[PDB]
Design a protein around this ligand. Sequence first.
Ligand SMILES: O[C@H]1[C@H](O)[C@@H](O)[C@H](O)[C@@H](O)[C@H]1O
Ligand SMILES: O[C@H]1[C@H](O)[C@@H](O)[C@H](O)[C@@H](O)[C@H]1O
Ligand SMILES: O[C@H]1[C@H](O)[C@@H](O)[C@H](O)[C@@H](O)[C@H]1O
Ligand SMILES: [Ca+2]
Ligand SMILES: [Ca+2]
Ligand SMILES: [Ca+2]
Ligand SMILES: [Ca+2]
Ligand SMILES: [Ca+2]
Ligand SMILES: [Ca+2]
Ligand SMILES: [Cl-]
Ligand SMILES: [Cl-]
Ligand SMILES: [Cl-]
Lengths: 136, 136, 136
Amino acid sequence: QTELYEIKHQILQTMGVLSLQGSMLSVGDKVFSTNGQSVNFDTIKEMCTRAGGNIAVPRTPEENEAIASIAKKYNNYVYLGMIDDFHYLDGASVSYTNWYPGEPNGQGKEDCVEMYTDGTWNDRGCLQYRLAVCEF
Amino acid sequence: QTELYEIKHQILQTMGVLSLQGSMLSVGDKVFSTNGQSVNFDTIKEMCTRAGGNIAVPRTPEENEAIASIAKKYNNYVYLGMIDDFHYLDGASVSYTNWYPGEPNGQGKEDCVEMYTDGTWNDRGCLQYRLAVCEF
Amino acid sequence: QTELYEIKHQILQTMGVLSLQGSMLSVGDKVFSTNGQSVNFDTIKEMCTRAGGNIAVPRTPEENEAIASIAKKYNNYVYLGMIDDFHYLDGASVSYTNWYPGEPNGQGKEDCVEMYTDGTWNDRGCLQYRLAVCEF
Ligand SMILES: O[C@H]1[C@H](O)[C@@H](O)[C@H](O)[C@@H](O)[C@H]1O
Ligand SMILES: O[C@H]1[C@H](O)[C@@H](O)[C@H](O)[C@@H](O)[C@H]1O
Ligand SMILES: O[C@H]1[C@H](O)[C@@H](O)[C@H](O)[C@@H](O)[C@H]1O
Ligand SMILES: [Ca+2]
Ligand SMILES: [Ca+2]
Ligand SMILES: [Ca+2]
Ligand SMILES: [Ca+2]
Ligand SMILES: [Ca+2]
Ligand SMILES: [Ca+2]
Ligand SMILES: [Cl-]
Ligand SMILES: [Cl-]
Ligand SMILES: [Cl-]
């Protein structure tokens, strides 16, 4: 009983501190974070995996708003965890989308997806330097 | 048994890291933190709430010293969680006080309380930009 | 059951965020961290203790690589938790070593141990300013 309450309180304290610092954003069960570095898609995947997480992907409008707020705050385009019928990296077809008007427009050439600072998406090649955002 | 020990150890590790980084200060059951931003009283309240916490207030001399050390380290005055008979934001009358000599002196005009870098207090209007310190 | 799973997941989320931020490095049960400050040996010990940890020491090749990566990333020599037969600060004789060629060479004069950015060690006096690395 009391053991568990203190434990839960301390966890919420640490998450509160991280949230206040701008080191994380929590949406439901998901936690999004960036260290502010920009690298290509594969390198973001490697960085996220190294930390025990995955490259971020928005599966809901609230998750999209959260990642967009990161893009806007750090002022850079962001690579999302999807790959060209776009799929999540787990192999499932993407449900929620937020394409910029006219996108996706690069079938066969643009396999990745970047998010603009306004939260909309563009299919893009995977070799640009983009803000690394992970989800845990 | 062992499940709980590992969990507790990991929590203390994360708190240790945050403490070392200067991202938190722990006094008893309370954790104080700032992100170094300066905004007005209402905006600090909004920032703290957003992170799952509350604007910091010292209820003990040790808590006062902790928040003072934050004010001194970030070198800015700090708004405290009290409002003019001063009350905590939970509605209770303030017990512990540490007024600068001659304060409070602004009844009816100065509804907020700021802490100086030496840890003493002054009643002040609520519309200055002050270091945002939260408690969790 | 479910209580514990959610707790464990949240802990791993916070550790993931800290890892991504570069605020910690995890090797087995140990967590290494620096705040980037440089001070002398005693002062590092005081800083680590204050945070609830201890000055870092590598007891395995993997731990050595981890601390070396911190030295390399922050680009400074690091004081290790050992003191001249070198002993850990717990009083036990050091097992794993990684001396730079020709070291240790300062018996009676060089009581501390610093790590270079390439991960090798040198016995040194204790009064230099070195990157503070703690272990939790
Ligand atoms: O992905 C492409 C590409 O980035 C082009 O540079 C741009 O002009 C297009 O609008 C966009 O669809
Ligand atoms: O709150 C007031 C105000 O800040 C005045 O500027 C100052 O001169 C007073 O000493 C103080 O009590
Ligand atoms: O510890 C000593 C010391 O740092 C000297 O400055 C250096 O030239 C030696 O090589 C080293 O062993
Ligand atoms: Ca495409
Ligand atoms: Ca496109
Ligand atoms: Ca007043
Ligand atoms: Ca006053
Ligand atoms: Ca020696
Ligand atoms: Ca030497
Ligand atoms: Cl490209
Ligand atoms: Cl004012
Ligand atoms: Cl020295």
